[PDB]
Design a protein around this nucleic acid. Structure first.
Ligand SMILES: [Zn+2]
Lengths: 43, 57, 49, 86, 49, 107, 83, 145
RNA sequence: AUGCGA
């Protein structure tokens, strides 16, 4: 249900997904403070 | 005075060796199968309580 | 890794596991939220089972 | 005569006799020594709700646990029975 | 209070530890399966419910 | 510290994190009416230093993430301004031990 | 993980858990023909033999106290206050 | 999973720390019953001195470090004898020294009751043959350890 | 599983 059937990608913004991968990567190492600090990186 | 039929005295059982379940290799159950009494969950908990982990293992 | 606050094998504690499950849950909420595609903008069919 | 062995013999001493200690769960040497098997199986506990349609059923073509090491038998063709009845 | 109602004595070390375990996450972390989820031992999870 | 009178809109709440080199805290003007830190059930919370934290984590040989947790939205965490990772020393009087010192990590 | 002996910070006393395990393992070794360092003085139970050895610190065992970090302190019987 | 680490902290078998001390005193319930029965210990003093004779052990530990912290803490405690005005300059003695290693690291609640006993019973210390609140206090600290 | 000793 989460995929796109015409492109075969996830319907979430690619950069937003990459943000999610980043958070879960930081939580493999359990770096929580940085996991929350990640949201601030903005332009 | 009346003698109750439950002479569980006669119902004693001991197993120092016996049959095993084929799927587990653990003592069968039941006096007539020379089965072994169960160490239930609470008795395990109690043996950990005592710290007697080599007795529990 | 410089600070030894983790290791090559990762870092694992009850709280890290908790933050992971919370994250994965909200993540599942975002994945389900999109009612049309974003990368492709396409309208996926509704899936029933 | 027939022979002994159609199951086990004590490879230790050359004593081809076997004991059953049902209290032990042990198959042992009738004359000599040791454990012929530590493993002992099928004398279930108090839990046979019998849901099992257990369609199998013995019929002497899958042999048997051989729980008698005592043997003599003979070669058979396959169920004398009809020749017996004849 | 619950034990005092039955005039049972129980050392505070027991209750106070139990409470500390209920707050291990900073919340009111019950002892059912739900609270068990966040603990790290997977077999303990398997072996409860 | 920003004391609102009734509410702040979530759109402004997207501004709350928006100036990194600085913290903004939103507070209910009605919810500040009482100092929870004066309440008889609330032991003394003392903010630990970076060095007091490093020492504590050394004496007990453990990671920060292995300490007992205090939620970032815990009223006391909001009172002390607890940052993430911050350890607080809790001096509590026990009905049996007297003064008893515990700790909590803010995550 | 090796906490240096000069740095050992733990209880000078043997816990009942320590005493129990030491006596069990050492008894078992003596029962497997480990060299006895004390007069058997008639005894036949290996466990009481191990108790005699503990009373004389003849046990040649060392306790590895674990810390949840993984650092440990290697303590001899001959030093940890038996009781 | 919940047990006592060798550092006296209660950690689970995971390693997650639950309490920095057991009940905050590191006291065994199976011991406590008389740990606060001072007068009883006193009338049977010589027997307990024969059990817990310290001269065997006075070589394995420190009898001052905790006692010295007891001196500074006794200062702040006599100065601060309201709750939120805590001893922030002095943690309890149990925070600063392993109670099994420096005789005297004891709960301030236990210390307080013990001293209050010694003051309210100075007259038994004026009825004894050969006992003093320094040797008796030494005994009660050693029983506590 | 139903009845029952503890
Ligand atoms: Zn798509």
């Amino acid at each position: 249900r989460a995929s796109c059937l015409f492109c075969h990608h996830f319907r979430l913004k690619s950069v937003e997904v990459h943000r999610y991968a980043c958070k879960l990567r930081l939580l493999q190492y359990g770096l929580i403070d940085e996991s929350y600090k990640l949201d601030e990186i903005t332009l | 005075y009346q003698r109750l039929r439950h002479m569980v005295n006669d119902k004693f059982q001991v197993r120092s060796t016996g049959p095993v379940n084929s799927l587990t290799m653990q003592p069968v159950k039941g006096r007539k199968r020379h089965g072994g009494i169960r160490v239930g969950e609470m008795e395990r908990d109690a043996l950990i309580g005592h710290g007697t982990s080599f007795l529990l293992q | 890794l410089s600070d030894g606050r983790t290791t090559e094998r990762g870092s694992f504690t009850a709280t890290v596991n908790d933050e992971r499950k919370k994250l994965v849950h909200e993540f599942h909420k975002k994945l389900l939220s999109r009612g049309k595609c974003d990368n492709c903008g396409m309208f996926s069919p509704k899936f029933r089972k | 005569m027939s022979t002994f062995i159609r199951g086990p013999i004590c490879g230790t001493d050359n004593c081809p006799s076997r004991l059953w200690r049902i209290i032990d769960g042990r198959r042992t040497c009738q004359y000599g020594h040791v454990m012929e098997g530590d493993v002992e199986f099928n004398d279930d506990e108090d839990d046979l709700n019998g849901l099992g349609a257990g369609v199998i059923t013995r019929r002497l073509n899958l042999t048997t646990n051989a729980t008698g090491s005592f043997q003599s038998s003979q070669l058979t063709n396959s169920q004398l029975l009809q020749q017996q009845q004849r | 209070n619950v034990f005092s109602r039955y005039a049972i004595s129980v050392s505070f070390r027991h209750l106070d530890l139990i409470a500390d375990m209920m707050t291990r996450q900073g919340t009111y972390l019950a002892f059912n399966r739900q609270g068990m989820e966040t603990s790290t031992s997977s077999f303990m999870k398997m072996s409860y419910e | 510290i920003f004391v609102y009178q009734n509410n702040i809109t979530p759109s402004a709440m997207k501004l709350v994190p928006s100036i990194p080199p600085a913290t903004i805290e939103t507070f209910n003007e009605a919810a500040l009416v009482v100092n929870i830190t004066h309440h008889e059930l609330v032991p003394k919370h003392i903010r630990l230093s970076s060095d007091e934290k490093r020492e504590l984590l050394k004496r007990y040989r453990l990671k920060e993430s292995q300490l007992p947790r205090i939620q970032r939205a815990d009223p006391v965490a909001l009172y002390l301004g607890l940052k993430r990772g911050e350890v607080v020393k809790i001096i509590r009087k026990s009905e049996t031990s007297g003064r008893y010192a515990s700790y909590r990590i803010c995550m | 993980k090796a906490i240096p002996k000069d740095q050992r910070a733990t209880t000078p006393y043997m816990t009942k858990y320590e005493r129990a395990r030491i006596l069990g393992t050492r008894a078992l070794q003596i029962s497997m023909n480990a060299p006895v360092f004390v007069d058997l003085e008639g005894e036949t139970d290996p466990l009481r033999i191990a108790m005699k050895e503990l009373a004389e610190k003849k046990i040649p065992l060392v306790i590895r106290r674990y810390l949840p970090d993984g650092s440990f302190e290697d303590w001899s019987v001959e030093e940890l206050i038996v009781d | 999973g919940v047990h006592v680490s060798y550092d006296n902290s209660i950690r689970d078998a995971d390693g997650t720390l639950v309490q920095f001390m057991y009940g905050g005193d590191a006291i065994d319930i199976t011991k406590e019953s008389h740990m606060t029965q001072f007068e009883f210990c006193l009338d049977n003093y010589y027997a307990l001195l024969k059990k817990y004779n310290p001269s065997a052990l006075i070589e394995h530990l420190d009898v001052e470090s905790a006692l010295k912290y007891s001196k500074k803490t006794l200062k702040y405690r006599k100065k601060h004898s309201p709750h939120y005005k805590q001893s922030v300059k002095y943690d309890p003695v149990l925070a600063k020294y392993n109670p099994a290693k420096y005789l005297g690291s004891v709960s301030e609640n236990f210390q307080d009751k013990l001293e209050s006993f010694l003051d309210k019973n100075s007259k038994l210390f004026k009825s004894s043959d050969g006992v003093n609140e320094k040797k008796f206090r030494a005994l009660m600290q050693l029983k506590y350890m």
